[PDB]
């Protein structure tokens, strides 16, 4: 029987200890299974918790460059919230939308010289050549302030002709 | 890893009613083992889905392959339909060589749709660079995209545009060198092989355990049913079932430990997609030796292969 | 009753979440059990003892030893030509299931009236003076009238039986002494006369003998066991293929389906084992045909439910089972029953496997990978966003 009281109350020492020994082998097996499984999980949960600590540390106390680490899109921030037995991060991210094409050119030929966006991209709506920034359409006249020259334009593959505004000369005039 | 399920009843008894009544009388260990076996499979399906299914739109490479000299016929889907796998991928797949209640379940994602995922990913990288990972894909001539990468690395665009042939020659040659190395040199997929080995060998054990006497008169429970009468029959059977139950439980635990290891490796692989492939990584040596430029994903029997471009001064 | 209930119990909850649950396992069972032992050839010479023309006297009972053969006692027992069948120690039947080291056949001839004394615990002239047997012997006594073979006109006096002797005879004792029996005046000293009588007398069988006095042939078969050499009889059965069958090939017992095999066994090889020493093929000894053994199908039942909440309609998936052996639709994961095949392609709802999924009537399709869109690539074209969106997601992570 599985009740060790009925085995104490039904049998005398020798076969009592026999049956009890069997129960104790079985129970000891079961405990030891349990404790091991609990272990394996505790290792899993410890891994998950140190991932969560990393997520605090980087997403919440700072802005993460790690793509999709702190949510889909370009991370902006995250807020932590408690849960019964874990944490919930609400992550703000910035997601571009409402696309629009543009013809591009790696550089611009002007005065026989190649110009290269200092930070941005050369784009044309249909006829006119603006230099924008990559993640938001904000076109803006091409200027020596916002382009940098590097050599002639016999070597760049795909360069395009255009005029690079020089924002002195009208100041001289 | 291989998704295995084990019928505890049959594997312990194997069509023996009296062994069955003994083991049900022994407790409910079969549930736990089964249901961990499940957990561990559905966790395998979840590694794959995570690592590969990052993009929800299947991008198609143009019919016209004008990428500024860069040649990616070797990684791009083969129209010849060798399962729609790139010649790298065929190479990787053919470089790895793959009854008692132990079955094998099939993976949810077939090799064909994994290859298709990698193809969408790789095409979205060639067309759009990293902006297919932040939202909607935006085209870019890929010469500019490589100028932007260079910019990121800490090189000016003129270095690329002046040098564009040389860089293209160079990246072709490196792809060809990967092609020979994976074609002739062996032991290149040692990790995936080791995983397959270590699983296959746990099974060959647990099977080979299934034929041990554990103190009984014999290891075939039929000869003990056919040679003995109930009382000592159940005795010997009880011993067999203690031994077999021990062996299963060992197995299932070891499989667990591994499944945790593989889950760690898979989430590392998902991070590597997410950052190296859908973007340019600042993390030094994370996406290869040198200044990361990009990475391309390729499928494998039971893992992923990242080909990472990096820029190395000289 | 039905799969949805079976699932309900498997989960111990009356409310089922939408998904697939693995409830039970379906097994095939053996039918038409078969046993096959080799083509037919080493039988014990019982006929050489029974049909034997010459038998010795009762006091000179002849003993023979039998070993290293196969004895078929069924023919002897079911003969109807013997009037004496007394097996002690073992049942007269079911003798084909017993194997012993040796068999001792003690044959002799007596008259019918004396057939009674041959049994344990009995006393009599023949038993005490001619042939005494052990009290606790394990064997069988056979005997039959032999009038036509032992009766001769004018008296067949070749048969002799001892009358007078002093002691008793001990078990398994053969005495041939012919010394004149002494009845007492002085020792005979090889001289007869008063109180000196010849120990043995002749039966003198005649054709007109009475039933009691008619001759009877008696043979006692004693089985000695202490490696057994003489075992039981090989009615093998017929071979059936392409069905789950419980088979026994020369002691090798198993369950499975036997099919024609292309494997070529060597002349001295009987059965072939696959890796892990599991039996894979067997050569049937009767005709030396090599047959591949395959475990007759079995595999898991998974139950696909859209949720009790939504509908009580269910689907079974028999896993890695060819369900010709059971809207049946075949997939690389097994077969699905109860779920209509469609060619469409949606997002995966309930994952079945091998690239098929189910969804709610319950429809089984081939999951779609997602909206397939080709990017309008051109070597001088870029796409730039003109708006943005502030997206807030939630990531939950267990800590403790
Ligand atoms: C997956 C599979 O084997 N499907 C089989 C098919 O090949 C075979 O022609 C038929 C005969 O039973 O049954 C079904
Ligand atoms: C770019 O593409 C057009 C057609 O798509 C092709 O004719 C042209 O030669 C290519 N050259 C450059 C510099 O983009
Ligand atoms: C299931 O049925 C209950 C019954 O009260 C209903 O109230 C609940 O909304 C349903 N749940 C789902 C998930 O549909
Ligand atoms: C799907 O349905 C039928 C067969 O069941 C087939 O005739 C039809 O053309 C298929 N539709 C496809 C492949 O789009």
Author numbering:
A (entry chain C): 974 to 1146
B (entry chain A): 731 to 828, 855 to 1070
C (entry chain C): 293 to 518, 521 to 620, 641 to 674, 691 to 730
Quote from the publication:
The S-1.29 and S-2.15 reconstructions showed good densities for Nbs bound to the closed RBD and to one open RBD, but poor density to the second open RBD, so that, we only modeled two 1.29 and 2.15 Nbs bound to the S. The group B 1.29 Nb bound to the edge of the RBD core and to its inner face, in a region that overlaps with that described for class 4 human Abs. Nonetheless, differing from human Abs, the 1.29 Nb interacted through one side of its Ig domain (see below), which run perpendicular to the RBD edge, this binding mode and the small Nb size, allows the single Ig domain to accommodate between closed and open RBDs in the S. According to cross-competition experiments, the group B 1.29 Nb had a non-overlapping epitope with the group A Nbs, which was confirmed by the cryo-EM structures. This Nb engaged the RBD core, and its epitope was mostly outside the hACE2 biding region. In contrast to the other Nbs, the 1.29 CDR3 (FG-loop) and the GFC β-sheet of its Ig domain made an extended interaction with the edge of the RBD core and its inner face. The CDR1 and CDR2 of 1.29 were not at the RBD-Nb binding interface. The group B hcAb 1.29, which bound outside the RBM, was able to recognize all RBD variants except omicron. Contrary to other variants, omicron RBD core mutations S371L-S373P-S375F overlapped with the 1.29 epitope.
